[PDB]
Paper text:
Recent discoveries of several new Paramyxoviridae species, including the zoonotic Langya virus, have revealed much higher antigenic diversity than currently characterized and prompted the reorganization of these viruses into the Henipavirus and Parahenipavirus genera. Here, to explore the limits of structural and antigenic variation in both genera, collectively referred to here as HNVs, we constructed an expanded, antigenically diverse panel of HNV fusion and attachment glycoproteins from 56 unique HNV strains that better reflects global HNV diversity. We expressed and purified the fusion protein ectodomains and the attachment protein head domains and characterized their biochemical, biophysical and structural properties.
Cryo-electron microscopy structures of diverse fusion proteins elucidated molecular determinants of differential pre-fusion state metastability and higher order contacts.
Author numbering:
A (entry chain B), B (entry chain C), C (entry chain A): 22 to 482
The structure:
């Protein structure tokens, strides 16, 4: 890539950032109960829980039936001389993708630990705090957690005899209907097929009044650096069990780990407007360029958070990049497109390494040390300003100071090649088909005329 | 549609789902009061409700003025000695669309029932619970409801003498300002024209701390099947009265009914990547195809929820399609495009009716029963695997079982007709059309060369 | 612009609205403390504030480091006869844009007032209410504000001895972790570079359970009309100080003011479907047209709120338009494109100035006073109906009265030039591009043949 030609065409090299991808995940199991455990309210609660049970039995049971029907269709057992491999039976899957088969194998792998967690059903249903721990084994533990258990241990419990019992029943019914509406939002796409559709940690934290840090601290991941603070909206978990007796869900989440792809640099660009032809134009180049061993591609930051030093993505998002745009980035300024603007929010100057790239035709350029104006050179459009011209520079309304030097060759003195204008809207490209087509039928008419005139020239002699 | 040629090019038939549209609605009236009724706080509340009244009088009154002005135009009694009905006076409406005139007719139809509800203004303003009923007639009733009437009957009421009166006044002012900010979000677009703009039930349920099931249960709709549980984010409603004395809004909502369009099947397609020309490509086909009497069209699922067995749309979204795409779907795989990728998240195998469609050039394919590798045939690109090859198949890492057979036609032996390499669907191709225009401009130069050929043609003398 | 021809092609003139821009901002200063002040809880709270302090020290300190670096970059000085200020070092700033330099100038301008506010740190840390005032000067005041200061002055405080102290500690820890999760959402992008990134007032009001009116009333903006009532999501603001001892942020916000751009009219358009060629078509025109002294442009209403009478934008959004679209709007109906639909939600009639523009080919048109059908004229496509034809018009199932007069010439007696069908598909444009491929390879072959003829027969004999 040549930055001098691309600076003369109107693109200024910005920051250089690294590239990191989530990869190599380990698994940790949590359990979520859905019916709140009340024991202080054994005096005045009536049978208000029965409506909530009839509301959630239409959600829990169709999850569990599809889960166990997905569980039957994988069977282990040795295929002859080969050792193992947990055969997924394709007779009873109908139509399935690769990720669905991977999820089926994940359930068949997690069956034993699901049974180990399910062996403590009486231990799970007896909790009476928000988040606590239970001893799973000699060194393993579960992290059972319920959002509403605090609210019927510090708000509704002290009004056990001050307030009337029917008011407690009505308030409990209102809060349970609101919470049932909260389950019916996060577990919405899961009801289609609750083995392949995962659960984001932000939507899962929406059950606890938007408390992501409680889930993160109870899970075990503890961020200590600046890059892992904004990261935390991408922990992904899936359902492995949907037990109906205690009305609870056993969930398995993946602890992320940020690996770095070797030798990849993300390059940002600043686009300014230049005055040509009596109009304001901008180059049509993408902002982000991924460079890895003199190989250029495109990425999209539609799901990736941008930190101060590196790009953190969920997964690789490398797209192929144009050979014409490859010539545009490398050497050919004529291959780079342009677009027309007239709006007022177009920047006209920028700073890079103590080097001012300024359009001095529209913005007044001066030097404070000598008090003389700076005029546009006719050979270039974007004006170099460095310390060789003047130290203190008036640009816009601003005193600025400069430094360093040009760098290899100056982009002010060489020739320029302005590319063609590029438009967008489909009526314009239908008219582009038009002025393709009249020119096309001129070329065909010239083919016919020229080929007749060949034989009156070559044939006649 | 022929699935065999489209599987040979790289598109696999997915599930088949039905199509159902909301339609034929009945109407039901609710009322929402805005001033919370306090009678327990007659000792220590001061006149803090007056600021809330002055805040909401700038909202209720300009709604009510336009609401009575839009019903002041339509008049009944068709001049026709025989024909009779409602007439909309177009000279006073100015500029209007069809739905605005339909809403004006709806208000003129609902004026009598709005007056019947307005006849119990003293009954509406005397409520002191969250949701209750009032006797509208001998068999009809209203469902008056207040969001904050629970919170100043179970939280602020018991601290009537423990806490200081100015602290209750400050807390009531903070709660009323927050609630006034909650009215100023949901009734935002309604302030422009409060007769033609409907209200979604999610935005209306945002007033009640996100409790949609409370409004669904108090309205009368009780879903009992799996399809209607996820439905309930599309119940619309419009304002019919904006009474300023009791500061309440009489609202009319439509109970939805899911009707089924006869003989329409929604079909999905799974796209896999095939290795051709030393590169990874996928065919460019839409995922969703509606089929109705051998007629193919296009739908967009941007506002339609997807259930497990059918598509539920708020309204018909049938878009036309190109005849080239019709030939691509029917017989002509040369009319189907292809696009180029190099990313890692491209699936290379899938399962359909026990038949494995796998690209064995990129993924290692083996058989467990015989332990021999499977090689790509040169006459095809996508490899078909059934029980005739081998029962247990090694794909990737997974053991899988297969079943059934080809059905009618086999993609394993058919000829290949991979079409043109179509370029980028977004605007970048126009930039290519830009240099195609530059190609045109060099053919114009060729025309200019034939402006110089026609010169030396005149040197034929 | 001629509305008769544009009504003949299928576009109906809608409402006329004004255009207003937010501009000329003055500055106000607020301070946001982060640690809630507790003094009633000196008996039973333990040291649970220490974990919250260790959580927020990772947020506060890098902001302060980046801010003091940005103050170090600017340097107050005067090279000769200068404006006695500014001066930013190019070497110390690296790579930057214009807005970042403007933000550096803003911090250097607001340093003195930041020190004046910072002189009352002991006054800032001693507050015990939600929002109160402190005397900054003889006529200036600050508006120190805390969101959770109400909730540990009316809810956790009265249960000081009824509830156990460990339950108070657990509830305080849960509330503080939830609030730390609330800081880690609004100041998310601000951690990257905390001097050039603004804070929206809606995201800032999300800390106080979505109470925008509390911030607006405590800030000083008191909107009293209908236009500025919905405005209030565009207040914005930036950070100027990040003090670590009291753990507070000093923020500077802009009080808005709406100015009017002179002589600009925003025009909407209603698009109806017309039946031509046995198909249903709509013209391809933009909805919004800005007209300013015969100068047409395009605007995008993606960030602008639409009131009843005028458009309010955060900033000017004038985009250029194609001259063929200018010919479409002025005189040429053949320059206006069209698109094909078959869906049912296409409006077929409208009303403008008491004049009915209706498509009577698809929808039945009758006159109620005379009881005769209305037939489509072959010369026109869209039927004009006024009081000269019949007063009461059956359209659809509706009575419509008409009036006023026609307006210059009718859109029914003029000729209609239907433009080209704008309908673009990637495979079709790739196929005609392959026609261009074979076309230039024909023209280059014939030009090589004609150049050989230019060589050895122009010098022949
Ligand atoms: C999930 O799997 C269990 C276990 O069945 C095993 O896996 C299946 C995929 C097949 O390969 C089976 O051959 C295999 O054993 C299924 O439970 C079984 O259900 C059937 C009915 O579908 C039961 O048969 C009944 O049993 C008693 C006999 O007294 C009577 O009530 C009836 O006459 C009837 O025969 C069967 O006992 C039961 N268990 C076993 C071990 O086979 C289960 O159906 C399956 N799928 C789902 C969707 O739940
Ligand atoms: C809504 O419609 C009502 C009904 O009147 C109808 O519309 C009018 C514009 C006329 O065309 C009528 O023929 C037609 O029935 C309007 O109510 C009218 O309001 C005006 C004031 O706006 C009243 O005039 C005043 O009323 C009292 C009468 O004691 C005195 O102060 C004055 O002497 C003065 O007349 C008028 O009485 C009243 N009723 C009628 C029958 O005209 C109303 O204006 C209209 N529009 C709106 C925006 O509400
Ligand atoms: C921000 O600015 C402060 C203030 O310093 C002033 O501005 C700088 C840009 C320079 O032009 C300074 O000359 C100018 O006074 C900087 O604080 C200064 O930091 C240095 C270290 O970088 C301190 O030096 C210390 O000196 C003694 C030596 O015995 C020891 O305590 C230490 O080992 C250390 O070397 C210096 O005292 C300090 N203060 C002043 C008034 O100069 C600061 O570094 C700068 N930048 C940042 C990123 O914070
Ligand atoms: C509401 O439910 C709670 C659940 O915690 C009951 O809490 C009770 O709290 C008391 C102290 O306030 C506990 O008594 C003491 O506990 C420890 C452990 O043995 C020890 O210091 C003493 O020996 C003494 O027993 C008590 O254990 C605990 N009870 C239970 C069942 O958890 C509270 O009583 C309930 N309220 C009502 C009205 O029942
Ligand atoms: C808050 O306001 C409400 C409503 O005005 C008041 O509710 C009242 O509650 C009392 C409870 O003692 C009810 O008393 C009734 O007494 C007899 C007992 O023989 C019997 O008829 C009932 O079972 C009932 O207990 C009273 O009817 C009820 N009032 C109404 C209008 O429903 C309440 O007093 C107020 N609270 C305060 C603190 O002022
Ligand atoms: C919890 O903190 C609050 C903070 O406000 C303490 O409030 C105290 O309120 C009482 C009245 O309830 C005040 O006493 C009286 O105030 C007025 C003067 O304004 C006057 O009537 C009397 O001369 C008398 O002073 C009191 O000033 C105020 N502050 C303090 C420090 O007591 C409340 O006491 C705290 N509770 C506990 C248990 O610490
Ligand atoms: C593009 O640049 C190369 C050198 O990098 C040069 O050889 C070639 O002629 C250029 N092509 C143009 C300007 O079309
Ligand atoms: C640019 O070219 C001019 C001559 O045209 C020369 O004086 C100047 O030094 C050049 N700048 C460089 C090589 O940086
Ligand atoms: C296409 O090329 C011609 C000839 O150089 C030029 O006049 C025209 O502006 C070009 N069009 C575009 C859209 O670049
Ligand atoms: C030129 O126009 C004709 C219709 O007159 C059309 O059939 C043909 O495809 C066009 N050729 C192009 C756009 O290259
Ligand atoms: C499309 O396929 C049919 C047979 O399925 C064939 O007759 C026809 O010629 C094909 N059309 C093309 C290749 O354009
Ligand atoms: C496909 O061709 C194979 C030979 O490669 C043959 O065995 C098989 O019967 C063919 N299937 C058809 C024509 O359906
Ligand atoms: C556009 O309209 C003008 C008159 O306003 C006319 O002279 C011109 O020929 C038209 N151009 C077309 C229809 O292409
Ligand atoms: C349209 O022309 C007809 C005659 O063809 C005439 O009757 C009618 O008044 C005209 N409309 C105008 C000039 O608005
Ligand atoms: C069309 O483009 C291809 C590459 O896309 C090129 O090799 C060829 O020369 C062009 N012409 C023809 C006739 O294929």
């Amino acid at each position: 890539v040549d930055f001098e030609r691309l600076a003369s065409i109107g693109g200024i090299k910005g920051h250089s950032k690294l590239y990191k991808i989530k990869g190599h995940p380990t698994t940790k199991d949590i359990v979520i109960k859905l019916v709140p455990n009340l024991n202080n309210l054994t005096v005045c609660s009536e049978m208000s829980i029965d409506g909530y049970l009839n509301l959630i039995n239409a959600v829990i049971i169709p999850i569990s039936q599809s889960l166990e029907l997905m569980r039957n269709n994988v069977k282990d057992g040795t295929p002859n001389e080969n050792i193992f491999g947990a055969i997924v039976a394709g007779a009873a899957l109908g139509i399935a993708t690769a990720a669905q088969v991977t999820s089926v194998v994940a359930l068949h792998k997690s069956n034993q630990n699901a049974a180990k967690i399910n062996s403590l059903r009486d231990s799970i249903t007896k909790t009476n705090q928000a988040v606590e721990q239970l001893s799973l084994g000699v060194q393993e533990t579960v992290s059972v957690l319920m959002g509403l258990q605090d609210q019927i241990n510090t708000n509704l419990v002290p009004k056990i005899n001050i307030l009337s019992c029917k008011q407690l029943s009505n308030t409990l019914n209102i809060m349970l209907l609101q919470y049932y509406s909260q389950i019916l939002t996060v577990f919405g796409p899961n009801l289609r097929d609750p083995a392949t559709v995962p659960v984001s940690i932000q939507a899962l934290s929406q059950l606890f009044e938007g408390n992501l840090e409680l889930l993160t601290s109870s899970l075990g991941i503890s961020s200590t650096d600046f890059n892992d603070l904004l990261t935390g909206k991408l922990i992904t978990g899936s359902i492995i069990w949907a037990d109906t007796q205690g009305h609870y869900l056993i969930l398995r989440v993946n602890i992320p780990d940020l690996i770095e792809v070797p030798g990849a640099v993300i390059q940002e660009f600043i686009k300014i407007g230049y005055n040509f032809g009596g109009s304001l134009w901008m180059p049509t180049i993408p902002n982000k360029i991924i460079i890895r061993g003199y190989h250029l591609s495109l990425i999209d930051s539609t799901n990736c958070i941008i930190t101060d030093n590196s790009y953190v993505c969920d997964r690789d998002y490398s797209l192929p990049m144009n050979p014409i745009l490859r010539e545009c980035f490398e050497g050919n300024t004529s291959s780079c497109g342009r677009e027309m603007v007239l709006n007022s929010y177009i920047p006209l100057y920028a700073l890079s390494e103590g080097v001012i790239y300024a359009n001095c035709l529209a913005t007044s350029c001066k030097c404070a040390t000598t008090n003389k104006p700076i005029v546009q050179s006719t050979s270039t459009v974007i004006t170099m300003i460095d310390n060789s011209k003047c130290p203190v520079v008036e640009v816009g309304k601003q005193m600025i100071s400069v430094g360093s030097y040009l760098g290899q060759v100056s982009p002010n003195n060489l020739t320029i090649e302005i590319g063609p204008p590029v438009y967008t809207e489909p009526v314009d490209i239908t008219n582009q088909l038009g002025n393709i087509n009249e020119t096309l039928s001129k070329t065909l008419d010239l083919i016919k005329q020229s080929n007749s005139i060949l034989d009156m020239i070559t044939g006649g002699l």
